[PDB]
Amino acid sequence: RNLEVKFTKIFINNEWHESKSGKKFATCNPSTREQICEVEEGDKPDVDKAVEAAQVAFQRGSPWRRLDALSRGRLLHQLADLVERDRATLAALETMDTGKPFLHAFFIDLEGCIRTLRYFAGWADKIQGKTIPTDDNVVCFTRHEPIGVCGAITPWNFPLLMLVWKLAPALCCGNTMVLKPAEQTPLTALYLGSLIKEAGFPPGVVNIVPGFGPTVGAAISSHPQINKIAFTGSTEVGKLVKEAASRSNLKRVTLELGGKNPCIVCADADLDLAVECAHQGVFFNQGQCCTAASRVFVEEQVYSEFVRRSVEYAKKRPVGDPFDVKTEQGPQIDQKQFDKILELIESGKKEGAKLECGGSAMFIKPTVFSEVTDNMRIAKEEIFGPVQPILKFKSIEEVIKRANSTDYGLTAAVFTKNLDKALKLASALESGTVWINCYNALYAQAPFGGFKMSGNGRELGEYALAEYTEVKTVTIKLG
Amino acid sequence: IRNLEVKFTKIFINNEWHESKSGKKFATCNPSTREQICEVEEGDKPDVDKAVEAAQVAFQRGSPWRRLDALSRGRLLHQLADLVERDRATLAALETMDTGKPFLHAFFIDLEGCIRTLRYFAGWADKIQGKTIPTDDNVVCFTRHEPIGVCGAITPWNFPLLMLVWKLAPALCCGNTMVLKPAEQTPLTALYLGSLIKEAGFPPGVVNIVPGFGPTVGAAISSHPQINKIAFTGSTEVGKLVKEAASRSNLKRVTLELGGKNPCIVCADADLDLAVECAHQGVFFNQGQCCTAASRVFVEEQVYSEFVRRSVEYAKKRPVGDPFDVKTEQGPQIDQKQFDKILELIESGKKEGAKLECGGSAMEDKGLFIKPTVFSEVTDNMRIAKEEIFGPVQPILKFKSIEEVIKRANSTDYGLTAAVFTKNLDKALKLASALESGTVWINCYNALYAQAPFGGFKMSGNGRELGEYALAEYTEVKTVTIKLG
Numbered sequence: 001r002n003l004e005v006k007f008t009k010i011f012i013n014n015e016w017h018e019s020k021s022g023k024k025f026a027t028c029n030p031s032t033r034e035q036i037c038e039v040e041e042g043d044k045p046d047v048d049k050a051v052e053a054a055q056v057a058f059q060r061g062s063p064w065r066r067l068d069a070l071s072r073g074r075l076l077h078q079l080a081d082l083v084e085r086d087r088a089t090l091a092a093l094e095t096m097d098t099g100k101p102f103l104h105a106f107f108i109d110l111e112g113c114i115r116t117l118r119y120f121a122g123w124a125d126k127i128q129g130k131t132i133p134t135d136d137n138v139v140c141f142t143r144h145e146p147i148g149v150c151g152a153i154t155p156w157n158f159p160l161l162m163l164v165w166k167l168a169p170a171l172c173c174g175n176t177m178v179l180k181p182a183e184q185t186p187l188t189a190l191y192l193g194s195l196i197k198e199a200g201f202p203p204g205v206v207n208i209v210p211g212f213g214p215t216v217g218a219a220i221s222s223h224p225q226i227n228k229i230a231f232t233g234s235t236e237v238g239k240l241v242k243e244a245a246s247r248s249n250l251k252r253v254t255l256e257l258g259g260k261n262p263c264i265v266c267a268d269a270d271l272d273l274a275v276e277c278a279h280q281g282v283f284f285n286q287g288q289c290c291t292a293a294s295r296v297f298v299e300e301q302v303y304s305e306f307v308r309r310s311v312e313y314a315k316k317r318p319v320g321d322p323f324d325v326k327t328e329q330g331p332q333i334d335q336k337q338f339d340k341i342l343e344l345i346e347s348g349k350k351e352g353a354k355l356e357c358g359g360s361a362m363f364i365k366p367t368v369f370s371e372v373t374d375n376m377r378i379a380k381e382e383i384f385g386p387v388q389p390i391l392k393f394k395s396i397e398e399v400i401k402r403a404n405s406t407d408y409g410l411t412a413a414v415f416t417k418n419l420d421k422a423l424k425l426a427s428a429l430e431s432g433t434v435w436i437n438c439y440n441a442l443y444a445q446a447p448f449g450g451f452k453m454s455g456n457g458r459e460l461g462e463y464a465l466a467e468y469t470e471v472k473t474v475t476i477k478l479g
Numbered sequence: 480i481r482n483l484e485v486k487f488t489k490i491f492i493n494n495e496w497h498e499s500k501s502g503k504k505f506a507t508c509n510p511s512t513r514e515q516i517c518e519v520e521e522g523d524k525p526d527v528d529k530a531v532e533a534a535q536v537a538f539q540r541g542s543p544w545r546r547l548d549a550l551s552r553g554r555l556l557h558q559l560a561d562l563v564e565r566d567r568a569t570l571a572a573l574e575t576m577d578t579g580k581p582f583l584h585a586f587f588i589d590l591e592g593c594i595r596t597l598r599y600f601a602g603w604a605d606k607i608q609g610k611t612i613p614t615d616d617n618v619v620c621f622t623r624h625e626p627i628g629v630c631g632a633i634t635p636w637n638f639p640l641l642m643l644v645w646k647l648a649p650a651l652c653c654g655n656t657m658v659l660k661p662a663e664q665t666p667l668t669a670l671y672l673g674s675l676i677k678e679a680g681f682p683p684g685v686v687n688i689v690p691g692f693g694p695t696v697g698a699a700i701s702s703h704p705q706i707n708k709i710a711f712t713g714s715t716e717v718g719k720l721v722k723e724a725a726s727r728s729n730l731k732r733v734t735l736e737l738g739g740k741n742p743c744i745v746c747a748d749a750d751l752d753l754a755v756e757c758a759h760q761g762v763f764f765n766q767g768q769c770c771t772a773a774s775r776v777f778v779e780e781q782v783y784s785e786f787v788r789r790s791v792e793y794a795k796k797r798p799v800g801d802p803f804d805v806k807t808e809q810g811p812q813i814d815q816k817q818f819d820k821i822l823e824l825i826e827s828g829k830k831e832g833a834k835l836e837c838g839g840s841a842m843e844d845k846g847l848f849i850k851p852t853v854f855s856e857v858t859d860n861m862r863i864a865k866e867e868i869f870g871p872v873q874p875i876l877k878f879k880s881i882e883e884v885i886k887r888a889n890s891t892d893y894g895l896t897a898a899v900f901t902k903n904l905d906k907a908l909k910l911a912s913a914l915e916s917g918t919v920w921i922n923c924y925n926a927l928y929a930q931a932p933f934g935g936f937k938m939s940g941n942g943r944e945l946g947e948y949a950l951a952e953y954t955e956v957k958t959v960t961i962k963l964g
């Protein structure tokens with residue numbers, strides 16, 4: 001209920017720290033506008049410090065480096081155990097900090113945090129190079145060593161999850177990390193730093209430096225002693241991080257960004273499954289989600305009954321308090337976007353699109369657009385709010401071209417009972433994940449990540465391990 | 480072959496030759512005789528835009544190329560490698576003409592390396608393999624390793640045709656399409672291959688070649704919003720530029736290979752005669768102008784002197800002269816910028832206080848050649864020891880303990896390659912593990928195989944080439960996750 005925030009400082013070498021400037025910023029609560037607490041405002045000197053602590057704890061011969069590969073997973077299981085223990089604490093904090101429904105934060109976010117952690121615990125002693133057939137007198141092989149100090153920079157929509165998805169793989173491969181969390185949502189990250197010292201990782205293996213994007217985050221992406229970065233958030237902000245990494249240190253960068261992620265309904269598709277899952281992927285977590293559906297193509301044979309059954313759904317879903325055990329949808333975080341959404345609601349009005357339900361606030365009331373075309377703004381642009389822009393199509397080959405036309409591509413969900421229509425579509429769509437008769441079906445063992453401008457690199461899979469290893473070749477010649 | 484005329488100097492788009500949309504041209508010179516081979520078309524963004532739209536369409540869904548069978552793709556690559564072998568002495572000549580590589584070197588290394596690489600990756604085409612992943616009882620989930628799309632490739636002058644092939648083979652077996660820009664210093668063989676690409680029967684628009692200049696064609700490729708992936712072999716300087724440009728627009732995926740301060744450790748318990756021979760050809764091969772050249776040579780005290788003495792006779796004994804001669808080992812350096820720039824670094828050596836055991840100045844001024852040069856008593860903070868010299872210079876150093884030289888070699892930001900010589904099982908391996916280098920040879924030098932990946936650690940690269948690992952850089956992972964009733 002009323003839960004005290006106990007950790008608010010820079011986490012470095014498993015000791016709690018103050019800004020080298022003593023500056024502080026103050027996270028608030030989107031549910032009820034209320035300053036939660038005051039967190040230390042780190043910055044380049046603070047970063048500079050943690051990055052050194054990471055280099056030391058990564059140095060050869062350190063207690064971290066010498067750990068038996070399986071004891072690396074022992075820790076990772078220990079940390080997951082702890083997360084498991086203090087689970088609702090985290091769900092509570094993550095709710096206070098983001099305004100997610102407390103259950104949503106308890107059964108999705110933290111279930112994902114716990115599962116993702118143990119999955120990569122598995123991999124710690126299964127990271128295998130190759131032994132390669134070359135010449136008769138030559139032993140050749142490759143090792144998959146850890147890259148070094150790893151930079152993690154995450155968004156406020158799934159703070160602890162987006163954070164674990166980078167921490168779990170990075171630590172099993174045996175890097176050390178400097179973590180830098182949103183400003184909107186720094187609480188759960190800072191908690192996990194307690195759990196990290198408790199499970200007993202060596203000091204300096206993980207370090208957290210909360211603060212601001214252009215200050216702290218930008219210090220990371222430019223730092224000469226960080227060897228890799230993982231970023232989850234804004235397309236355009238990723239562009240800069242890639243740039244800075246390139247200008248300084250040539251570090252390895254992997255990004256996960258947004259997208260106009262399509263949602264395709266065929267004539268023979270289960271309609272209640274299609275309509276409802278199209279709903280879960282436009283209105284879940286208040287519409288702000290890496291996996292949200294910018295576009296919803298529907299074949300002419302089921303258009304109106306699709307559009308009709310859709311508007312029935314929007315009006316019945318409960319809004320209100322986040323600690324509500326009867327709600328689905330809390331508030332938005334930063335009104336900076338609140339403006340441009342219910343502006344975009346007029347974009348479709350202005351270009352000739354029927355608005356079948358909703359279109360203003362009370363939060364925003366869930367909205368639905370029929371008669372939408374491709375060229376309208378409300379189908380050209382990502383929307384971090386509930387806006388269901390429903391289009392129409394004759395051919396499978398038609399919607400293939402239409403849905404693939406944007407420069408983004410992180411998610412596509414297809415709905416059909418037909419075997420040929422399922423597979424033909426999946427193979428064609430230029431999307432990192434293609435879901436079929438389901439939405440937001442993320443698993444810790446299937447890689448997530450972007451095609452085209454939705455990012456580069458993958459996360460959550462055996463493929464994740466690639467982004468946290470440098471491949472060394474040994475080539476030995478005998479006499 | 481001697482007075483062989485250059486047949487190929489135009490731009491290759493959709494398997495048609497072309498002139499500059501501009502009309503301009505530019506010359507390539509023979510560095511051995513310092514005279515002009517001929518003029519090639521100078522491309523620019525409007526040329527690059529032409530080729531990209533070509534490639535964009537040869538990769539379009541249902542293209543002859545995309546509907547093509549997977550093993551047939553393999554067959555074409557095997558087909559193109561046949562042609563190379565046939566026209567091998569044409570190409571190797573062209574390569575020596577353009578670069579002053581000893582011709583025999585280009586025919587037994589360079590071109591050999593090209594055919595072998597084309598064949599390895601030809602073999603990977605029907606064996607690009609994704610995963611099926613267990614998840615819940617009611618879900619089928621699996622991954623496909625789709626091709627990326629239009630892949631830029633941009634390569635230097637030190638191995639013009641080999642650096643091109645290292646990218647073309649994997650990308651082409653993986654089902655991509657390509658816009659290639661060779662170095663302006665060395666455009667001849669990249670064009671010849673384009674002739675063979677067409678003969679081998681590749682669909683038009685699957686490979687395209689626009690020659691021209693770094694800032695002009697190069698950057699137009701790196702920034703182009705419809706190119707989906709770049710490979711770059713070149714300098715660290717240009718390397719940071721190209722990754723930056725890709726970041727600024729279209730967020731392309733970028734893989735980079737760019738030189739190093741490549742350590743060559745020689746332990747006291749070392750076949751010394753092998754160490755001098757390999758750490759000699761290691762330093763000096765290809766006129767010392769190599770991505771993997773040997774720059775800092777660490778030797779243990781117990782053997783420091785007699786190593787140096789053995790290195791210095793090799794240096795004088797090793798033949799320099801006409802590339803077409805069958806007894807040559809070191810042709811000329813590539814151009815005037817390099818020759819002066821290397822000659823200058825020599826003086827920093829003299830003037831930073833290091834015994835000039837041999838050579839030390841250029842010879843027979845009417846050529847672009849340099850006396851093979853050795854140094855002694857070279858300390859760390861010294862200039863010959865901190866910077867990539869791209870030429871014949873052999874700075875030797877003293878070292879005491881293993882842990883001394885582990886720390887000393889991982890002191891740079893580079894780390895493309897390293898050699899270690901010892902007979903000691905634990906030394907070789909302890910060194911092999913601790914060195915921050917991409918490849919680590921042991922009791923050999925310059926041992927590249929297509930099956931083994933090659934690439935940089937730290938500021939020497941991102942990603943790899945020539946291995947099953949190259950496929951990673953030319954495929955995009957998709958996850959298909961089906962749910963059942």
Ligand SMILES: NC(=O)c1ccc[n+]([C@@H]2O[C@H](COP(=O)([O-])OP(=O)(O)OC[C@H]3O[C@@H](n4cnc5c(N)ncnc54)[C@H](O)[C@@H]3O)[C@@H](O)[C@H]2O)c1
Nearest residue numbers: 153154155156181182183212213214217218233234237337
């Ligand atoms: N003003 C507009 O036109 C407009 C419109 C809609 C949405 N938006 C975007 O919505 C975003 C919502 O926040 P978000 O976290 O989901 O995305 P984001 O890109 O802001 O996420 C950035 C993450 O990285 C850090 N970061 C921020 N700026 C950085 C920089 N310049 N260099 C390095 N690291 C940096 C932050 O601390 C946070 O961790 C805003 O950042 C904003 O760009 C803006």
Ligand SMILES: NC(=O)c1ccc[n+]([C@@H]2O[C@H](COP(=O)([O-])OP(=O)(O)OC[C@H]3O[C@@H](n4cnc5c(N)ncnc54)[C@H](O)[C@@H]3O)[C@@H](O)[C@H]2O)c1
Nearest residue numbers: 634635636661662663692693694697698713714717814816
């Ligand atoms: N006439 C000339 O300008 C000229 C001639 C000889 C030598 N040089 C210089 O000699 C050095 C030799 O370097 P190297 O060839 O080993 O590698 P490099 O990094 O100089 O060039 C690698 C390749 O990158 C391409 N490139 C160059 N600059 C680029 C840019 N800004 N954007 C995009 N692509 C670009 C070029 O076509 C070249 O083939 C370079 O400094 C080179 O430019 C220049």
Ligand SMILES: COc1ccc(-c2cn3cc(-c4cc(OC)cc(OC)c4)ccc3n2)cc1
Nearest residue numbers: 107108111112113115116440441442443444460
């Ligand atoms: C309609 O009722 C449902 C209630 C609940 C679920 C449901 C989804 N879940 C997802 C995870 C998980 C793990 C992640 O990283 C591994 C990422 C991620 O993002 C979605 C989710 C864990 C548990 C879970 N349960 C489905 C249907």
Ligand SMILES: COc1ccc(-c2cn3cc(-c4cc(OC)cc(OC)c4)ccc3n2)cc1
Nearest residue numbers: 587588589591592593595596925926927928929
């Ligand atoms: C003294 O006994 C020998 C035994 C074996 C060899 C030997 C090594 N080789 C390496 C290549 C090759 C291939 C490349 O790409 C695949 C790149 C590259 O660049 C340096 C070289 C080609 C031929 C070759 N032969 C020599 C001498």
